[PDB]
Amino acid sequence: GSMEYEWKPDEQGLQQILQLLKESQSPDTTIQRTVQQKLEQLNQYPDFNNYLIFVLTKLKSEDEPTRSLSGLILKNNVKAHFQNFPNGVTDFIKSECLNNIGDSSPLIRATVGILITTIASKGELQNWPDLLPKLCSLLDSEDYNTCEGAFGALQKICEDSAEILDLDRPLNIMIPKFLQFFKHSSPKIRSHAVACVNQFIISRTQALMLHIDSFIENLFALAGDEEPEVRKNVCRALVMLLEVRMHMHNIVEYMLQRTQDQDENVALEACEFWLTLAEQPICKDVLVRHLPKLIPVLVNGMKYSDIDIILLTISDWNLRKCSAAALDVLANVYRDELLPHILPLLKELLFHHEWVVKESGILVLGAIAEGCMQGMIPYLPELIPHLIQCLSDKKALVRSITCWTLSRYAHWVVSQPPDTYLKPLMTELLKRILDSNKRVQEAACSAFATLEEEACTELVPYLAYILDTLVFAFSKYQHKNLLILYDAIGTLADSVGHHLNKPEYIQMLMPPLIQKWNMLKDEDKDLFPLLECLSSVATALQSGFLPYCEPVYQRCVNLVQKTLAQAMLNNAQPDQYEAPDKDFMIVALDLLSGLAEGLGGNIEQLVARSNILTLMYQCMQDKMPEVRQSSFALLGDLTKACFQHVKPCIADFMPILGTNLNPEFISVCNNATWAIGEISIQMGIEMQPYIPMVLHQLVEIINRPNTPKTLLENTAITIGRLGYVCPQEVAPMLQQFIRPWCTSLRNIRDNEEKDSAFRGICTMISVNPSGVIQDFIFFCDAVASWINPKDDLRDMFCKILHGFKNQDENWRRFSDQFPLPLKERLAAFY
Amino acid sequence: GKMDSRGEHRQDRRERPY
């Protein structure tokens, strides 16, 4: 009795909708494409969705391929167009979907379930607030399909939306009910519970840390459960808890015994545990014992599955990748200390005949290279040739993995004679780069890139064959590997530097890049790598690139102009104008950057008669850090190129860099900092006024923990130059910045930047000598960094530095505290 | 010089499984 309610449609649209569904099930394809569009077009009503769900709930006298299809098209009508949703009509969807879930038919259960989940995750958890309490009340079990359906709905809801739940904070009452179903008889319910709870563990919410003590104790009881899903969610829970928590004695045996499970998915869910463990500092003194059982298991998984060989695409994270990664982080934890565990296996598999295993062996060699590098060197002189000859294999996977794994020992290959190792590697590598198989081209290129990156100037004599084969591949490649070809040539010019500047090498390399240059338009995204490629090439061709400087420079300035214009338009009126892709600015600037770094003063004629400085001053204020990074880099290159044109704009530049000194934008800060450096050595004494704005930030930056060494080096050079030109304003900070300055300035070459930096510090010390005394050790340390100093600089060190030593009794007790080689190098050199 | 997303990009997109 009491009170009730319901909804009733009419015989109007039900017949037409039923004909549209019965014909929307037609075996023809044109009928599906027609009727499905007509139904996605008959949504202009507020009542239509109540028609569909009326077919789902009350139309109990109709075949299920029609009912479930109606509910599914309702799913798409809510998930798709939900802004024009009638609220009162959707109420019927809420009540009917909520109360008709325990239907005995599994199909209706599944479609209603996905209706509830899509209504929740697409309709948010706010507008409908009586859903979760009624689901949790319906969760107290009855028959079977009821609590299982509402439970699964809570699984997909808790899998999608999770943070938002942290309804009077209801999760406190959720966990015990899960625990009530945590010791359930049916395995599926439990597998739903574990996966339900596994979402709120990495988020380390405040509701679980109270009900966790017995939670995990109970979690261990599901160790011997048979349903692969239960093992999946449980092992998942342990892997996730390994990151935010520190029974380790038997869990290692359960996991290692479970790593060889019959299901590769579950074995993966248990395989991430080794990554999460090897990341934490606990793995050092807990994992070491039972390893000889672990290593072969990993190698047992590192072979390609029977499934994956046929799809060659592959997935993106498998037991293969997870095993290789686990072996990676473990090798990085142990360094040379894992040779015994593996070496017999390598000696075996590396010379097998069934290649499916040999591939695994070569991959394992690639997996321990970075980790166990120092202990692997002695075995190498025989290892590489077997890989060299392995490059001549006929099967593709072994050839490619030979390219990459062979590429991983680029240092030892290039740190030995060339005609012995580097020449044959380059030869065969180039011969397999021109392959009929795609992955061999891409992986062989991405191996050549590393080979040049570690080889550098050793590639000068062979540039004819290198460029010949690489441009043969240029005209012979496709598109997805062409990006990596641009990578290879860019890394080339970056590696072999100026020695590229020969007219016939230009005749090999430049005609195709000019063809690709001419055929492409400005709105084509493929210009992103090309310019970048040319950028590095513009660094190497130097003055030989003069005949083509005008058009390239012009096109870059134009691109910048257009992009900035569009930016302004989107800034003034979003609803009418378009927003641009600012990736066009950076790359352009990069080229311009590189252009200066290739031509120097030869760019003069171009920089004056082109309103480009103003464009830079407009770029340096944008929102994305990338354009400030690249724009400041260009500012440095232009400052060292020509300063007769930049001088006035300097007045409006230094304040910008005054606010662009921020470590949160590392990629920018360095460049910004570097700019000031190249400014000071050009501004001379004129650099005087702008000091108090940049200096007090720079010194605070140079004494920071967890700071990249490149930023401390460019900051060091900047402070040095600011001191060389403005010693009276920079000098008093010596007690405050002298420590990490020379502490970090030990890992540099000897040219001009370090020279002007040490001139600056020498003038600043001659002007304020009181600052460095208590830390003078460090200074002497830095003085041990010079191998070829100039005459005047040498005099600067030996004369005054001699003054400190001449004022002879205490410099022994104070001197014999740092190593002898530097001691007698300073004592004999200065 | 420049903490280049160029050099870091072309370094990252070098293909490998390990």
Residues of A in contact with B14 (CB under 8 A): 446-447, 449-450, 484, 487
Question: A269 near A261, Cβ under 8 Å?
Answer: no
Contact B14/A at CB under 8 A: yes
Q: Verify whether the Cβ–Cβ distance A324 to B13 is below 8 Å.
A: no
CB-closest option in A442, A443, A667 to B3: A667
CA distance A490 to A146: 62
Q: Verify whether the Cβ–Cβ distance B6 to A532 is below 8 Å.
A: yes
Residues of B in contact with A635 (CB under 8 A): none
The tokens for A157 are: 């809801």
Angle separating helix axes A29-41 and A11-22, nearest 10 degrees: 150
Angle separating helix axes A734-744 and A691-702, nearest 10 degrees: 60
Q: Verify whether the Cβ–Cβ distance B15 to A626 is below 8 Å.
A: no
Query: What kind of experiment solved this structure?
Result: X-ray
- A206 φ, ψ (degrees, to nearest 5): -80, -10
DSSP string, A714-766: HHHHHHHHHHHH-HHHHGGGHHHHHHHHHHHTTS--SSSHHHHHHHHHHHHHH
Residues of A in contact with B2 (CB under 8 A): 590, 593, 629-630, 633, 670-671
| Closest C-alpha to A299, from A356, A249, A255, A248 | A356
Please give the C-alpha separations between residue A498 and each of A335, A460, A731, in angstroms, as whole numbers: 38, 10, 38
Which residues does A contribute to its contact with B (CB < 8 Å)?
A: 320-321, 324-325, 327-328, 363, 366-367, 369, 401, 404, 408, 442-443, 446-447, 449-450, 453, 483-484, 487, 490-491, 494, 532, 535-536, 586, 590, 593, 626, 629-630, 633, 666-667, 670-671, 674, 708, 710
Q: What is the radius of gyration, based on Cα positions, of chain B?
A: 9
Residues of B in contact with A316 (CB under 8 A): none
What is the least distance, in Å, from the CA of B18 to any CA of chain A? 5
> From A535, which residue of chain B is nearest by alpha-carbon distance?
B6
Q: Verify whether the Cβ–Cβ distance B13 to A494 is below 8 Å.
A: no
Residue A702: Cβ-neighbour burial (10 angstroms; 0-12, 13-18, 19+): buried
Question: In 10 A of CB A684, how many CB atoms?
Answer: 11
Residues in chain A: 830
Chain A / chain B CB contacts < 8 angstroms: 68
The tokens for A160 are: 């999608």
Residue type, A232: K
Cβ contacts of A178 within 8 Å, gap of 6 or more: A193, A196, A197
CA distance A108 to A71: 9
The tokens for A801 are: 């530095």
Chain centroid offset of residue A428 CA? 32
Question: In 10 A of CB A265, how many CB atoms?
Answer: 14
SS3 call for A622: coil
Residue A62: Cβ-neighbour burial (10 angstroms; 0-12, 13-18, 19+): middle
Q: Give the residues after which the backbone of chain B is interrupted, taking a C-to-next-N distance over 2.5 angstroms as a break.
A: none
Chain centroid offset of residue A791 CA? 47
Residue type, A405: T
Question: A748 near A785, Cβ under 8 Å?
Answer: yes
Question: In 10 A of CB A31, how many CB atoms?
Answer: 13
CA distance A589 to A582: 11
Measure the N-to-C terminal CA separation of chain B; round to a whole number of Å: 30
Residue A18: Cβ-neighbour burial (10 angstroms; 0-12, 13-18, 19+): middle
Q: Verify whether the Cβ–Cβ distance A366 to B1 is below 8 Å.
A: no
Q: Verify whether the Cβ–Cβ distance B10 to A449 is below 8 Å.
A: yes
Buried b (16+ CB within 10 A) or exposed e, A590-614: bbbbbbbbbbeebbeebbeeeebbe
Domain boundaries, chain A: 6-830
Question: A215 near A208, Cβ under 8 Å?
Answer: yes
DSSP string, A323-382: HHHHHHHHHHHHTTTTHHHHHHHHHHHTT-SSHHHHHHHHHHHHHSTTTT-TTTGGGHHH
> From A449, which residue of chain B is nearest by alpha-carbon distance?
B14
Residues of B in contact with A710 (CB under 8 A): 3
CA distance A393 to A111: 52
Q: Verify whether the Cβ–Cβ distance A667 to B5 is below 8 Å.
A: yes
What is the least distance, in Å, from the CA of A687 to any CA of chain B? 22
Question: In 10 A of CB A96, how many CB atoms?
Answer: 20
Residues of B in contact with A367 (CB under 8 A): 18
What is the least distance, in Å, from the CA of A61 to any CA of chain B? 56
| Closest C-alpha to A610, from A569, A683, A556 | A556
The tokens for A352 are: 């097998």
CA distance A153 to A115: 9
Residue type, A658: G
CA distance A10 to A772: 94
Contact B12/A at CB under 8 A: no
Number of H helices, E strands in chain A: 45, 0
What is the least distance, in Å, from the CA of B1 to any CA of chain A? 7
CA distance A28 to A187: 42
The DSSP output letter for A422 is: I
SS3 call for A109: helix
Q: Verify whether the Cβ–Cβ distance B6 to A483 is below 8 Å.
A: no
CA distance A749 to A740: 18
Question: A231 near A258, Cβ under 8 Å?
Answer: yes
> From B6, which residue of chain A is nearest by alpha-carbon distance?
A532
Question: A320 near A298, Cβ under 8 Å?
Answer: no
Q: Verify whether the Cβ–Cβ distance B1 to A633 is below 8 Å.
A: yes
- A177 φ, ψ (degrees, to nearest 5): -60, -45
Chain centroid offset of residue A63 CA? 51
> From B9, which residue of chain A is nearest by alpha-carbon distance?
A487
What is the least distance, in Å, from the CA of B8 to any CA of chain A? 11
CA distance A637 to A674: 10
SS3 content of chain A, % helix, strand, coil (to 5): 70, 0, 30
The DSSP output letter for A418 is: I
Angle separating helix axes A145-160 and A131-138, nearest 10 degrees: 140
**Which phi-psi region, left, alpha or beta, contains residue A286 (left: φ > 0; alpha: ψ -120 to 50)?**
alpha
Q: What is the radius of gyration, based on Cα positions, of chain A?
A: 34
Q: Verify whether the Cβ–Cβ distance A590 to B16 is below 8 Å.
A: no
| Closest C-alpha to A734, from A703, A712, A705, A756 | A703
| A6-830 topology per CATH | Leucine-rich Repeat Variant (1.25.10)
Q: Verify whether the Cβ–Cβ distance A490 to B11 is below 8 Å.
A: no
Question: A43 near A20, Cβ under 8 Å?
Answer: no
CA distance A421 to A740: 41
CB-closest option in A324, A325, A671 to B2: A671
The tokens for A279 are: 């990341």
CA distance A397 to A429: 15
CB-closest option in A325, A442, A633 to B15: A442
| Alpha-carbon dihedral sign for residues A74, A77, A80, A83 | negative
> From A665, which residue of chain B is nearest by alpha-carbon distance?
B3
The tokens for A668 are: 């920018």
Buried b (16+ CB within 10 A) or exposed e, A493-523: bbbbeeebeeeebbebbbeebeebbeeeeee
| Closest C-alpha to A591, from A493, A663, A662 | A493
Q: Verify whether the Cβ–Cβ distance B18 to A671 is below 8 Å.
A: no
| Alpha-carbon dihedral sign for residues A563, A565, A567, A573 | negative
CA A57, A58, A64 angle in degrees (round to 5)? 65
Q: Verify whether the Cβ–Cβ distance B15 to A670 is below 8 Å.
A: no
Q: Verify whether the Cβ–Cβ distance B15 to A404 is below 8 Å.
A: yes
